[PDB]
Amino acid sequence: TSQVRQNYHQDSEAAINRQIRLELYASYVYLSMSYYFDRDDVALKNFAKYFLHQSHEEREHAEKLMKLQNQRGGRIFLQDIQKPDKDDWESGLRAMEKALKLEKKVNQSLLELHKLATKKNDPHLCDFIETHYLNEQVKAIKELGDHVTNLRKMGAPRSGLAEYLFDKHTLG
Amino acid sequence: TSQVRQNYHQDSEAAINRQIRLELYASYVYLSMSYYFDRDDVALKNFAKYFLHQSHEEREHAEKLMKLQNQRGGRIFLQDIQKPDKDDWESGLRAMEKALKLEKKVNQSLLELHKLATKKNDPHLCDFIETHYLNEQVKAIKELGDHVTNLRKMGAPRSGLAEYLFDKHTLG
Amino acid sequence: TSQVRQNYHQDSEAAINRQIRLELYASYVYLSMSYYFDRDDVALKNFAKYFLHQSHEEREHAEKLMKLQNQRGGRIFLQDIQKPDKDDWESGLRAMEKALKLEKKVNQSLLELHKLATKKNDPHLCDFIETHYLNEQVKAIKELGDHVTNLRKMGAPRSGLAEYLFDKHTLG
Amino acid sequence: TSQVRQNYHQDSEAAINRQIRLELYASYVYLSMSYYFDRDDVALKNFAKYFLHQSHEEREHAEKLMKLQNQRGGRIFLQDIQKPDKDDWESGLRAMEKALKLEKKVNQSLLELHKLATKKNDPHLCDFIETHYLNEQVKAIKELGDHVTNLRKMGAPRSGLAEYLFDKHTLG
Ligand SMILES: [Fe+3]
Ligand SMILES: [Fe+3]
Ligand SMILES: [Fe+3]
Ligand SMILES: [Fe+3]
Ligand SMILES: [Mg+2]
Ligand SMILES: [Mg+2]
Ligand SMILES: [Mg+2]
Ligand SMILES: [Mg+2]
């Protein structure tokens, strides 16, 4: 048992390892999305940049959780990172819709993690989740919502004009 | 009853006065440790500096709790500050081990304080402890554990080269 | 068939996708290693830093292959990223020995990729591997050899002093 | 026989002269395309600018091959530069499609040149082609591919709004 460990439940430790894996998975999804938009037959450069930025941020989310595990005296156990659900993400709008679903999935996982920390009376872990993760998810969800709404109102996915102009004027 | 007091239980008020006393005691422990390393027969200047810095920080932790007590309309009651458990702290490794035990002790007090504040439905006080104290303790405990690990692996306390080089390369 | 595709064999495309997976795997190994050295019972922060930098580099290696795949009109197919072979990397020296073995493994894969590109008379792809990958591996392999040699000469992994001082003076 | 000539086959010398002619021809095609877009009845200034830039770059490509010919001790023999295939390039999309076709034609010639240099064991000439020509062609092809995709998706060449907006937002 770690010399630093204090008020850190075995279940919380295990839940943090699950969250790490999910953050790395989210990173991988966004990587896949990015390079879809880099294809010569899709060629929406600012969609690509937008998704690659998200990829890199997900990796930071994972790293901070790995730091937390070690700070609290848990032990990191890494797992296979599952490949994304799609190879072809279809359109700007469909990608954004899939991203919104991903962020809500990740948010639900974090809310389950907070429920467990609350049950185990771990206020440091509650604070960690609240400070560094929950508002990030609320902001990401709201932004993705806004993006999906605009793309739909502009006439996407059907109007190819719509994705081109959104790429330029919102994501540029 | 103070004109400012709202949702602040008498038990929380008393627990904050206990915490103030404990922060002042931790300050005094670290002061004693610092001046041990300043002795001509110990002479590890960066151990001394490390512990003196911790002493000053604990005094700040004490003052912020005093500020909080007054903010919430409680009344400060100071007690004798107990002398540290030792006069002679033996070695840099033993002082680091005692510092780790002390920080875990203060952390357990803050967790009990948070449990009480949760019980009394005092979210302002919960937030105060999480925001200013809990992560500070986690970082301190992790750092002290890291230091103990290194000193032991280096071959302390028998190898006096170990303490000299750690003083120079880690604490310098 | 992609409107940009020219002189780009289906076997080369498939081999690039295999290489992308291997670069992402190496990124994950180095991530694992990094956070091992961040543990409170290992506590070698420059080893952690060194392996984290290598992890981020590997991800860039992957992204550049993904870019090349799209430039040549191939199609990216991502796969599960397998977890590293170990959870616990034992020591600074043993981690460095495993990194050396990993870099040799990546290098052999790049040499097979070049053999294939040569056989398919793809000078662009040959140039790409030579310019961006082959010398980078040779440098990495030489540096890891140098590190292994020094740690061994210093007395690692039995001497914990050796790892401490190598962390400070070579990696810091 | 030039006092500088070494390992430079007469067939390679001849193929460099053919390449110079093709680069100058590409320069002329792009010049033609540029001033089509300058017409008062076409009036797409950023298409004009884009194609004039390419024209000037093709001339640089020609000059660097003339320099190479002299460096290796070959003798430059210039030929008539044939007029481009069209006088009227129809539209922004059709001009981009023709430019993609032209760049692939130039690329195929460079690959045939590299095959010849490889057969005559001329690594210097192989390196020259890879370093200065092959990746430049791959980037040009990918960029033209990207432009064609976007113009098509925006609804060109039917939608005159599409070419106007593309001229402003992508080529401006
Ligand atoms: Fe995340
Ligand atoms: Fe304190
Ligand atoms: Fe690599
Ligand atoms: Fe050219
Ligand atoms: Mg709370
Ligand atoms: Mg908070
Ligand atoms: Mg070669
Ligand atoms: Mg080369």
Kindly list the residues from chain B whose CB atom is less than 8 angstroms away from the CB atom of residue A4. 141-142, 145
Q: Quick one: closest CA in B to A70, which residue?
A: B142
Helix (H, G, I), strand (E, B) or coil at C40: coil
Kindly list the residues from chain B whose CB atom is less than 8 angstroms away from the CB atom of residue C165. 165, 169
Give the span between the Cα atoms of D46 and D54, in whole angstroms: 12
Give the span between the Cα atoms of B8 and B1, in whole angstroms: 11
Token output for A156: 């996407």
Task: Calculate how far, in angstroms, residue A103's C-alpha sits from the geometric centre of ligand 6.
Answer: 22
Task: Calculate how far, in angstroms, residue A16's C-alpha sits from the geometric centre of ligand 3.
Answer: 29
Q: Does D126 touch chain C (CB under 8 A)?
A: yes
B98-104, Cβ contacts within 8 angstroms, sequence gap of 24 or more: B98/B29, B98/B33, B99/B29, B99/B30, B99/B33, B99/B51, B99/B54, B99/B144, B100/A3, B100/B141, B100/B144, B100/B145, B100/B148, B102/B26, B102/B29, B103/B26, B103/B137, B103/B140, B103/B141, B103/B144, B104/A6, B104/B141
Kindly list the residues from chain A whose CB atom is less than 8 angstroms away from the CB atom of residue B93. none
Token output for B123: 């979210």
Contact C4 A67 (CB under 8 A): no
Backbone torsions φ then ψ of C160, nearest 5 degrees: -70, -30
Q: Quick one: closest CA in A to B117, which residue?
A: A123
Contact A164 D165 (CB under 8 A): yes
Residue type, C159: S
Give the span between the Cα atoms of B45 and B171, in whole angstroms: 9
Kindly list the residues from chain A whose CB atom is less than 8 angstroms away from the CB atom of residue B126. 123
Looking at the DSSP assignment, which residues form a beta bridge with residue A81? Answer: C81
CB atoms within 10 A of CB A115: 12
Sign of CA dihedral C21, C26, C31, C33: positive
Asked if A43 contacts D146 with a C-beta cutoff of 8 angstroms, the reply is yes
Asked if A152 contacts A168 with a C-beta cutoff of 8 angstroms, the reply is no
CB atoms within 10 A of CB B40: 5
Q: What technique was this entry resolved by?
A: X-ray
Contact A28 C73 (CB under 8 A): no
Task: Calculate how far, in angstroms, residue A73's C-alpha sits from the geometric centre of ligand 6.
Answer: 22
**Closest CB to C81 among A69, A70, A81:** A81
Q: Does D152 touch chain A (CB under 8 A)?
A: yes
Does C61 show up as a binding residue in the annotation?
yes
Kindly list the residues from chain D whose CB atom is less than 8 angstroms away from the CB atom of residue C127. 130-131, 134-135
Using CB atoms and an 8 Å cut-off, which of residues 39-78 of chain B contact chain C?
Answer: none
Closest CA to B15 of B95, B100, B122: B122
Looking at the DSSP assignment, which residues form a beta bridge with residue C81? Answer: A81
Token output for A106: 């990740």
Q: Does D142 touch chain A (CB under 8 A)?
A: yes
**Cβ contact D–C (≥3 pairs, < 8 Å):** yes
Contact D145 A40 (CB under 8 A): yes
Closest chain C C-alpha to D144 CA, distance in angstroms: 9
Contact B111 A7 (CB under 8 A): yes
DSSP structure class, residue D120 = T
Q: Quick one: closest CA in D to C2, which residue?
A: D145
Give the span between the Cα atoms of B12 and B4, in whole angstroms: 15
3-state secondary structure chain B: CCCCCCCCCHHHHHHHHHHHHHHHHHHHHHHHHHHHHCCCCCCCHHHHHHHHHHHHHHHHHHHHHHHHHHHCCCCCCCCCCCCCCCCCCCCHHHHHHHHHHHHHHHHHHHHHHHHHHHHCCCHHHHHHHHHHHHHHHHHHHHHHHHHHHHHHHHCCCCCHHHHHHHHHHCCC
Q: Does A118 touch chain B (CB under 8 A)?
A: no
Q: Does B171 touch chain C (CB under 8 A)?
A: no
Q: How far is CA D111 from CA C6, C7, D104, in A?
A: 10, 9, 10
**Ligand with smallest separation from the Cα of C21:** 3
Q: Which residue has the tokens 């590299």?
A: D114
Contact C3 D107 (CB under 8 A): no
Asked if C28 contacts C15 with a C-beta cutoff of 8 angstroms, the reply is no
Closest chain C C-alpha to A24 CA, distance in angstroms: 10
Cβ burial, residue C2 (10 Å; 0-12/13-18/19+): middle
Task: Calculate how far, in angstroms, residue D118's C-alpha sits from the geometric centre of ligand 3.
Answer: 28
Contact D134 C121 (CB under 8 A): no
Closest chain C C-alpha to A70 CA, distance in angstroms: 5
**Ligand with smallest separation from the Cα of B141:** 2
Contact D114 C123 (CB under 8 A): yes
Give the span between the Cα atoms of B146 and B156, in whole angstroms: 14
Q: Quick one: closest CA in C to D97, which residue?
A: C3
**Cβ contact A–B (≥3 pairs, < 8 Å):** yes
Cα Rg, chain D, nearest whole Å: 18
**Ligand with smallest separation from the Cα of C24:** 3
Token output for B10: 């008498």
Q: For chain D, which chains pass the contact test of at least 3 CB pairs under 8 Å?
A: A, C
Q: How many CB pairs under 8 A join A and B?
A: 40
Give the span between the Cα atoms of A43 and C76, in whole angstroms: 15
Q: How far is CA A8 from CA A17, A123, B98, C63, in A?
A: 13, 10, 21, 38
Closest CA to C44 of C100, C96, C101, C103: C96
Closest CA to A110 of A156, A148, A141: A141
Asked if C21 contacts C79 with a C-beta cutoff of 8 angstroms, the reply is yes
Binding positions of A for Fe cation: 23, 58, 61, 103, 137
- Residues B71-86 as b or e (16 or more Cβ within 10 Å = b): ebebeeeeeeeeebee
Residue type, B11: D
Contact C123 D131 (CB under 8 A): no
Which resolution in angstroms does this entry have?
A: 2.0
Residue type, C42: V
Token output for C170: 């070579």
Q: Does B102 touch chain A (CB under 8 A)?
A: no
DSSP structure class, residue A83 = P
Task: Calculate how far, in angstroms, residue B137's C-alpha sits from the geometric centre of ligand 5.
Answer: 18
Q: Quick one: closest CA in C to D114, which residue?
A: C123
Helix (H, G, I), strand (E, B) or coil at A29: helix
Closest chain C C-alpha to B126 CA, distance in angstroms: 28
User: Please, how many CA atoms are within 13 Å of residue B137, restricted to the half-sphere of its CB?
Assistant: 27
Task: Calculate how far, in angstroms, residue D61's C-alpha sits from the geometric centre of ligand 4.
Answer: 5
CB atoms within 10 A of CB A88: 11
Task: Calculate how far, in angstroms, residue D74's C-alpha sits from the geometric centre of ligand 1.
Answer: 61
**Structural element, H or E, at residue C24:** helix C10-37
Contacts of C84 (CB under 8 A, 6+ apart): A78, C28, C29, C32, C33
Give the span between the Cα atoms of A103 and A85, in whole angstroms: 15
Contact B145 C40 (CB under 8 A): yes
